[PDB]
Amino acid sequence: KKVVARVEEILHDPGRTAPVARVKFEDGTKKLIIAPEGVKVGDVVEVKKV
Amino acid sequence: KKVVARVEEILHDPGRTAPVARVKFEDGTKKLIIAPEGVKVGDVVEVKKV
């Protein structure tokens, strides 16, 4: 199934640099990750194999 | 730019459940995340806004 997490906080976001975000997975687990530029609190990201 | 991380270790993987993995982002940072079922060490995942 799809692995998605909601952006809870943007912790550190330099210009032209991907931010550090704290995200919450659908099981309720919260973790720090790197997320694409432009993401904001309340957005959702997917972790997908490439 | 794209945010990708290489799967370094599968820490916990129940059947029919997404595994806990330790991944390494392109800047060298390592973090625990949830990754899709079927991912194995050496695969690459992308974090993408949906």
Numbering used by the authors:
A (entry chain A), B (entry chain A): 6 to 55
From the article:
Here, we discover that the previously reconstructed ancient DPBB sequence could also adopt a β-barrel fold named Double-Zeta β-barrel (DZBB), as a metamorphic protein. Thus, these ancient β-barrel folds (DPBB, RIFT, OB, and SH3) could be readily interconverted by a few feasible mutations through the missing-link fold, DZBB, indicating their significantly close evolutionary relationships.
To demonstrate the hypothesized interconversion between the DZBB-fold and the OB-fold, we created their chimeric proteins by combining the design-1 and OB proteins. The sequences of the OB domains in the rL2 proteins from thermophilic archaea, Thermococcus kodakarensis and Methanopyrus kandleri, resemble that of design-1, while helix α1 is absent in the rL2 proteins. The sequence region surrounding β2-β3 of the OB-domain in rL2 was incorporated into the corresponding position of design-1, based on the superimposed structures. Biochemical and crystallographic analyses revealed that two of the six chimera proteins, design-6 (tkoL2_v1) and design-9 (mkaL2_v1), adopt four-stranded OB-folds. Therefore, the monomeric OB-fold could be reconstructed by simply combining the DZBB and OB-fold protein segments, without optimizing the structural interfaces between both parts. In contrast, the reconstructed OB and SH3 proteins did not interact significantly with any oligonucleotides.
